[PDB]
Design a protein around this ligand. Structure first.
Ligand SMILES: Nc1ncnc2c1ncn2[C@H]1O[C@H](COP(=O)(O)OP(=O)(O)OC[C@H]2O[C@@H]([n+]3cccc(C(=O)O)c3)[C@H](O)[C@@H]2O)[C@H](O)[C@@H]1O
Ligand SMILES: Nc1ncnc2c1ncn2[C@H]1O[C@H](COP(=O)(O)OP(=O)(O)OC[C@H]2O[C@@H]([n+]3cccc(C(=O)O)c3)[C@H](O)[C@@H]2O)[C@H](O)[C@@H]1O
Lengths: 186, 186
């Protein structure tokens, strides 16, 4: 079972995610994409990253309509900063017969260096890069690519959008927008 | 009444369209965007557009959920190649008290020169340029700009996608995908 782990803090989740996952899904020839949400984002524990419960909620709304997208709360499986090396380690254990790939966008590609235990991690799983507008890939690390239309949208956009009351339409599912307004986020 | 005429042949209409329009609507402080479908695309009369009726049908689906998006079939009422001069002329007559702006993406911007009566049209109404990924703005014509998130997605993408059965999800309203599938398009 060829699976693509798509970790992210999704605060909030937006179309850009949906499109990349859905495109990587096809391009890397995967069976299902796994949206894995951080308990507490490793690279940002000093940034004020929404309570998790709302992230997993917003996440569930953004991916319901796609049969091939599946939630994965394995990192929510208990306390401490969610370091991919630790998680992937664990995952390769629960699912030893499945083919696993991790997915990141241009953005993170630039961050590979600052990233806990990347040299051990890269040995565990293979990485798939996409290419996000504004950032750019180039890494000196083993990484496979997947052509994916560039879509300029990041959560931080929406958050500011959602606070200065700017559009946010056609950038996040109409379901995710409501949850935010409803549950008072951003 | 501040209006942004958003002409296109929309074959098919896609999120890129929806996104740009909804942004320009904000960025240029307009009251509503008018999606204006060609009867027969001026700049490509020897290609294949799809009979129109479907373009208007697909167009109608894409913009239903947005109260500020409106359909304008003015060009559909009177035969022959839909030249923006002729039309904007007429428009500036039916609506003498409303503020009218036209809208194009980097795509069209590059094309301003090969464009029936630009010099006289430019006199009639003000254009608002966006910027599409792949193309790029630079023109020697009087044009205003509206910052709008780059979204690399074209109808010609979809058409090919919809015919080599590739994803198309998250690129066109799901209502638009159905119409195509049901009505045997592309
Ligand atoms: N338009 C777009 N086109 C393509 N991708 C886009 C995108 N907008 C956001 N994305 C991003 O969406 C995904 C994730 O969303 P987002 O919430 O922004 O992701 P983010 O919070 O920045 O972090 C990405 C993941 O990498 C892991 N990480 C990060 C840093 C350090 C370490 C470590 O162990 O040391 C691990 C962790 O699992 C995290 O969930 C991809 O990472 C991608 O970069
Ligand atoms: N991702 C994206 N980001 C921003 N904009 C994007 C876009 N993808 C498509 N678009 C385009 O969508 C809009 C229209 O859709 P589309 O079907 O592609 O538009 P298109 O068929 O290329 O032509 C644009 C409009 O210009 C007029 N025109 C064109 C050529 C010659 C003459 C003449 O007077 O001789 C007149 C005509 O009224 C038409 O409605 C904008 O033109 C924009 O460029």
């Amino acid at each position: 079972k060829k699976i693509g782990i798509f970790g992210g803090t999704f605060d909030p989740p937006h179309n850009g995610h949906l499109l990349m996952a859905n495109e990587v899904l096809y391009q890397a020839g995967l069976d299902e994409i796994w949206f894995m949400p951080n308990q507490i984002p490793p690279h940002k524990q000093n940034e004020d990253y929404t309570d998790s419960f709302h992230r997993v909620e917003m996440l569930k709304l953004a991916i319901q309509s796609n049969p091939s997208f599946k939630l994965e709360l394995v990192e929510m499986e208990r306390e401490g900063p969610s370091y991919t090396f630790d998680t992937v380690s664990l995952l390769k254990q629960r699912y030893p017969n499945d083919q696993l790939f991790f997915i990141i966008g241009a953005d993170m590609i630039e961050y590979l260096p600052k990233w806990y235990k990347l040299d051990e991690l890269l040995n565990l799983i293979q990485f798939i890069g996409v290419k996000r507008p504004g950032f750019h890939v180039e890494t000196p690390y083993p990484l496979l690519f997947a052509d994916v239309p560039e879509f300029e949208v990041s959560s931080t956009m929406i958050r500011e959008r959602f606070k200065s009351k700017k559009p946010t339409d056609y950038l996040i599912p109409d379901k995710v927008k409501k949850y935010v307004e409803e549950n008072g986020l951003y």
